[PDB]
Design a binder for this molecule. Structure first.
Ligand SMILES: O=C(O)CNC(=O)C(=O)O
Ligand SMILES: [Cl-]
Ligand code: NI
Ligand SMILES: [Zn+2]
Length: 338
């Protein structure tokens, strides 16, 4: 139990680290999941890639100019697609006077500059690129193959996981933003920062998630009017100032190069990149997630949003409740602490 619900940081030895699934279980046994987010710093000797030089040549097919509109800690974000770009070209763009990180004293100061400068120059994010940049043969915490319940269902049972378990690359520059969200189907996610400047995160404990949603609904009654789960559009920014004022409990932490972040089922998070960087992420599941999956509020307003059938997971891992669940009689409220 982690009763404060504060974001925990783990520093495993190489032996404790080798097995991702085992380590995640250890993390949750210390109450890591109550914060909605955790940091894992792997041992210094562990390198998922020996040389990042070739990545400069990688193509970013569809870079995204992030346009923010709003005022005083409350913003909506929309994307404008830009020309394809190599990573080398993107790096040079990010480091130019227009797009580079401002001078700052410390992270708190930099955070302050972010919220103050959001509606000026629009940053460009190289987001959602299919792929992994781990060397072949790296078997520890390989984002491309984590072997979680998600992978078992896909391979043993022939069920479509939706490419929820496929790796994505994200090249950030200063001010590039990720709006408040939980993962598709309220899954876990894992995020590794390969190289470059940090990434700052805000997190809300799963046990206070509904309070963020309520606050969001108040500030964007428009958005809310058109969609039960509008936060899933990933367009809504709410500053910590606004959160503090309305008493939404949250925590913050900065991920540095070589660090893993793990977000947990129904753990709301958001944040921004400090400058040029490269992160790799995917979604994954555990048995504990199943109850979240069966109860997840989905996007009602679009066509192609991600929706995974929960039938196989309930049938295979919750056989005691399967029939009751299919009858609509599996009624419960989730203990985000267990
Ligand atoms: O780095 C980003 O663009 C945001 N990442 C996440 O929301 C995540 O890894 O779960
Ligand atoms: Cl700035
Ligand atoms: Ni996320
Ligand atoms: Zn929607």
């Amino acid at each position: 139990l982690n009763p404060s619900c504060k974001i925990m940081t783990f520093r495993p030895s190489m032996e404790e680290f080798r097995e991702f699934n085992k380590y995640l279980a250890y993390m949750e046994s210390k109450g890591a999941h109550r914060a909605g987010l955790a940091k894992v710093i792997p041992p210094k000797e562990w390198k998922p890639r020996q040389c990042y030089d070739d990545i400069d040549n990688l193509l970013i097919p569809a870079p995204i100019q992030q346009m923010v509109t709003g005022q005083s800690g409350l913003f909506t974000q929309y994307n404008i697609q830009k020309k394809a770009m190599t990573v080398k070209e993107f790096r040079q763009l990010a480091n130019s006077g227009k797009y580079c990180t401002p001078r700052y004293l410390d992270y708190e100061d930099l955070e302050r500059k972010y919220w103050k400068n959001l509606t000026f120059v629009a940053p460009i994010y190289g987001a959602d690129i299919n792929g992994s940049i781990y060397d072949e043969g790296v078997d520890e915490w390989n984002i491309a193959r984590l072997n979680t319940v998600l992978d078992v269902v896909e391979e043993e049972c022939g069920i479509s996981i939706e490419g929820v378990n496929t790796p994505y690359l994200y090249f950030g520059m200063w001010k590039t933003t990720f709006a408040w969200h939980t993962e598709d189907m309220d899954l876990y996610s894992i995020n590794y920062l390969h190289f470059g400047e940090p990434k700052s995160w805000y997190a809300i404990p799963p046990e206070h998630g509904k309070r963020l949603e309520r606050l969001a609904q108040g500030f964007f009654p428009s958005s809310s009017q058109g969609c039960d789960a509008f936060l899933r559009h990933k367009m809504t920014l709410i500053s910590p100032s606004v959160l503090k004022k309305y008493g939404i409990p949250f925590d913050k932490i900065t991920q540095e190069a070589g660090e893993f972040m793990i977000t947990f089922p129904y753990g709301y998070h958001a944040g921004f990149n400090h400058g040029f960087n490269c992160a790799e992420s995917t979604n994954f599941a555990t048995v504990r997630w199943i109850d979240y999956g069966k109860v997840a509020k989905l996007c009602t307003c679009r066509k192609d949003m991600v929706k995974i059938s929960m039938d196989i997971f309930v049938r295979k891992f919750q056989p005691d409740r399967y029939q009751l669940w299919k009858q609509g009689k599996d009624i419960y409220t989730i203990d985000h602490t267990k």
